[PDB]
């Protein structure tokens, strides 16, 4: 997309330069060893080490300095940006089947008691706890209940409006 | 009844069938009736191979040491895979390997079938005694007739040297890759001075 | 069942007749019994994949410590075989994707319909090399000519198999894992390890436990 | 006879010509692919005949058999014993074409069983067939003559893959060195 690579950026140079700068006249008010000093002391170390990950990590940058992310799997891949969407979307899918896998289990055990409404709103937490812990493993059973047909609910005991 | 260890509880599948049952299993490694005959069978082998590389390794050991052998003696039993013959290294190999093949296959479709390896392939006269069993074959085995006169009795005296062979085969083997020193030498060593020289002492000044 | 992974705790029901079964299933992934079936083939080429693998690392490397040969150590084995090789890279991966297309397509067909790889015109006139065993994993026929499925160990064998499988399994993601976090062979590893036990492990070689999430690393040192 | 004595043979192998026994594989199973594979053996074991006595009569006459094609590619004309032989590798393979697709399309046309494997009739003269007491005992010589021959020529194929020279000429380094010079040796056949 016609950028440049963040460790060889005029830009992103030049505003880490700036941010320490504002840091450092932030802390030549204070003495040293005191909190306040520290404290900016630390900002300015962890912006530094912020600055060489981002340029350490093969971001590229704009015209504005600034990182910018690259999201088709394609230019990821053969460009060494997939760090940057892809893996985390692959991390969130599988966090996200996990909290509604768990969500499911919980609801479909609930819906085998005496009092269903009563699991929703008062937690059976040694339950929870067990189907929580029993999500690691959705994928292979959420493919293995879409392969089997029991996933879904049939057409004909779902309730509709007339049409 | 003899044991291993008088006193002590015996496994209930060792009732003295076996030849030499001194109901010695602590690890109760052959409890299926057939991983037994197997062991049976795979004691035998290993110690009829042990006896044969037990005498082998005990007369070139105090020929090299006397003289009575030849140069070929005077290299360790270790050693002598690098004295030269008249046939390479990789030939000798392949021969032995292509008679153990048949003599081995015929001894395992005995060992399958009792029976079924008993006869001359090229000479239909020539069978072996029938009733043999899987480890003690008959006929041309037992040229003299030995096998009469306490057969129990000879089978007993067959798996004690087995046993002390395999022992003594394993020594052997340990002895050359701790002193690397020859059986002989090493039995030497225990002569001169038994207090000092054996297997504490030396294994403390090795480390 | 061979045994209990967690002793007092109650093991599944389905897990009872398996051969290699411990009643491990936390995660409940073999509860439908067509799964069951599925990831008991798919353990087995797994595991036979494994056995293969940690064989052709391991005794090479044995070989090499002690002095027998002179072999490429594993994660380098690549390089030198591929310029030495006849066939190209890409002709290479071409010729394998075609010939595990084959056989995988074979072996998820028989695992579909147990012995239809072995019918009348499955094969062109060779289908009696697969007539199968009629069992989940254990094809048989070629891959089993010196017949030992019909020997009174079958069992045990079954048995041998898994477990074996399982300690190959291991071993492979260790030697990648100790590859990337040490840099070295795994008989370079055992040797450190041996040499050192209490300092050369997997708590000092600057991987496996990151300086960021473990503070106190830095700190309780001498 | 039997192939591995004691073992169980199948039982569909029994009353067959040249028959041991020796299908641990079960390939013979099916009677449709068993009848096939005799056809399949016998045609196999007869070209094996002529592989050999060819590769060996010629080279016991002074004429390698894998340097017998070696005048089309490098350069020259094909030669028959001493004789000026005619025609051209390109006009070779047409009369190659011709002759054996025109044979062997009439080998399998018929609806026979038995005429596949043993023809007869103008196949055989100088007699021979008969009844039953001497054409099954030269049916057993078939197969097993033919057995070595195949065995053979896939030796002579092997040796030249390894050795890179004639059989002939291997027999010899066969009997001048029979400890230093056989399949073990070079570092072909068995590597390390
Ligand atoms: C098990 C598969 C496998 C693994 C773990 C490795 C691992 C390695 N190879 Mg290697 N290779 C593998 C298979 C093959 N390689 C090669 C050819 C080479 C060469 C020429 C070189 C390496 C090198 C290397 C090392 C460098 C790191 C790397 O390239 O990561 C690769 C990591 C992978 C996981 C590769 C992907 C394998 C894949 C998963 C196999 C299965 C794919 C199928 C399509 C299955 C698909 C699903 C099915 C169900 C449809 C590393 C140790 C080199 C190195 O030493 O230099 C730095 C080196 O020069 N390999 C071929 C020839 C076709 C293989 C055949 O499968
Ligand atoms: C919203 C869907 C979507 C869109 C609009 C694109 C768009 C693009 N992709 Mg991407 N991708 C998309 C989803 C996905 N892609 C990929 C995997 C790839 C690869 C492997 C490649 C692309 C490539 C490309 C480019 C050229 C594609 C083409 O048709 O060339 C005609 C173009 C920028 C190519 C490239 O990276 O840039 C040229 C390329 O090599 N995509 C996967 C994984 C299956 C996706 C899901
Ligand atoms: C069991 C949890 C659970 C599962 C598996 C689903 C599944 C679904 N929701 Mg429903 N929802 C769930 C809880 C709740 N939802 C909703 C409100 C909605 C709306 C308004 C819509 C959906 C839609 C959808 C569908 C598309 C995915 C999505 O849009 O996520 C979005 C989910 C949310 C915005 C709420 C999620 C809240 C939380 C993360 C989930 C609840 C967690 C449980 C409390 C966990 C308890 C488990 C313990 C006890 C073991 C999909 C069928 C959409 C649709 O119908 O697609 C066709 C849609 O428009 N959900 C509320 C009230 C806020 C919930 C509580
Ligand atoms: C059957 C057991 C046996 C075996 C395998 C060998 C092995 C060999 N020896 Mg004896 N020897 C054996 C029994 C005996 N050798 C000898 C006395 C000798 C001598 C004096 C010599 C051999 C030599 C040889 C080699 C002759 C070729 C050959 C490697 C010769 C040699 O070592 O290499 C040429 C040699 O000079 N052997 C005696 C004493 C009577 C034996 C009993
Ligand atoms: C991919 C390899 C693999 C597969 C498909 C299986 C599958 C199976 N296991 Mg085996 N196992 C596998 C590897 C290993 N297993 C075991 C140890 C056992 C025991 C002790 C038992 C089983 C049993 C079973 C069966 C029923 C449980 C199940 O549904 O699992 C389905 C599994 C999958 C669908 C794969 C899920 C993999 C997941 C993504 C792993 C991700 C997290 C891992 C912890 C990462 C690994 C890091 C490790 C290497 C440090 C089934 C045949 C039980 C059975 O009854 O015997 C047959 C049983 O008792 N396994 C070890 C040693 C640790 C392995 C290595
Ligand atoms: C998972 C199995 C496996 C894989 C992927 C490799 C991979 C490799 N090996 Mg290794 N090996 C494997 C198992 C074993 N090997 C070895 C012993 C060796 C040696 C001694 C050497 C290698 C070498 C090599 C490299 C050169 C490729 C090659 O061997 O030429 C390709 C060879 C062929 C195409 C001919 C062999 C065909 C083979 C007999 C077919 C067998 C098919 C069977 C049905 C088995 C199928 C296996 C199962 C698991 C699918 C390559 C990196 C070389 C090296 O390390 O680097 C240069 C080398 O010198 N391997 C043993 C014995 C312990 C194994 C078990
Ligand atoms: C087959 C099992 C196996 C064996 C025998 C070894 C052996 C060894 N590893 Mg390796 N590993 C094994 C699997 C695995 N390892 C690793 C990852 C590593 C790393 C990153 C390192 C080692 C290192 C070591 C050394 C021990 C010190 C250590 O850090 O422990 C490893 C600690 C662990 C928690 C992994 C243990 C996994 C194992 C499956 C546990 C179960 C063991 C069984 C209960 C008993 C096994 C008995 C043996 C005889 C089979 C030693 C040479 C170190 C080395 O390279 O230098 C000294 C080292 O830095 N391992 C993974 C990925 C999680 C494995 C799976
Ligand atoms: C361009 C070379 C080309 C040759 C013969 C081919 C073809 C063949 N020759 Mg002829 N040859 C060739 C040059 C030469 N050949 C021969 C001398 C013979 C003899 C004596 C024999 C053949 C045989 C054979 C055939 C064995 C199989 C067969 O069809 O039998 C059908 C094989 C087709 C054999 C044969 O034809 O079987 C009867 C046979 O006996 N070759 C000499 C030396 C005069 C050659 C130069
Ligand atoms: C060791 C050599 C050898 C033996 C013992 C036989 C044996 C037999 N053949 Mg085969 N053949 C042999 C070499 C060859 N045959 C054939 C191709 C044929 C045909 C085409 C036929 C035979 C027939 C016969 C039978 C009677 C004729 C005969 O040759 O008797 C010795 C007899 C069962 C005939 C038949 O099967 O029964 C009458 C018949 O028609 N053979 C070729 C290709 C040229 C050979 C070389
Ligand atoms: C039975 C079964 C059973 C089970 O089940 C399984 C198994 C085991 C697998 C199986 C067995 C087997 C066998 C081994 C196979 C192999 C074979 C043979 C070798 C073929 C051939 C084949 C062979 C034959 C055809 C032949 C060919 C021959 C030819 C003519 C040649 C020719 C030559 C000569 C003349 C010389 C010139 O100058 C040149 C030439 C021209 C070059």
Redesign the interface.
Known sequence: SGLTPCSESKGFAKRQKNEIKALTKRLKQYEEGSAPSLALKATIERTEKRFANYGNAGLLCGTDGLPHLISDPGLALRFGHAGETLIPTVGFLYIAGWIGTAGRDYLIASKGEAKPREKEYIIDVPLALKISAQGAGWPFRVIRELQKGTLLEKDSNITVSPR | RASWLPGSEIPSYLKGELPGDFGFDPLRLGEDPAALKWYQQAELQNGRWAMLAAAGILFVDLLGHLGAGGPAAATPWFKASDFTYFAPTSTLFIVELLLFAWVEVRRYQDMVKPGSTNQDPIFSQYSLPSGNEPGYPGGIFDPLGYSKGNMAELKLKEIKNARLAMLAVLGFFVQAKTTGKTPLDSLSSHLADPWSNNVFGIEHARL | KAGNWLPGSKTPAYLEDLPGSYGFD????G??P??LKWYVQSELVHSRFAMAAVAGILIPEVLKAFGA?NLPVWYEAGKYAQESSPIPFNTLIALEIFAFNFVEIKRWQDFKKPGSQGE?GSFV?????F?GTGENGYPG??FD?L?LSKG??YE?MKLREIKNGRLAMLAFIGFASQYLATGKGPIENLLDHLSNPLANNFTTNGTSLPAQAHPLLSVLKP | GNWLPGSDTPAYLDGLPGSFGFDPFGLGSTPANLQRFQEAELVHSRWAMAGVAGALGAELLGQDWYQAPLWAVNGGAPTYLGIPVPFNLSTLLAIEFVAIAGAEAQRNAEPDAEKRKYPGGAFDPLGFSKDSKVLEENKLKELKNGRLAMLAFVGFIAQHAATGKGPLEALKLHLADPWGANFATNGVSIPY
Not at chain 3, 26 to 29: D, E, G, Y
Not at chain 3, 125 to 129: M, N, Q, R, S
């Open positions: 936390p995660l409940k992934l509860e439908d067509a799964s040969v009348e006139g060779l289908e009696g090399f007539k026929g070629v000519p017949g009174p160990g045990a």
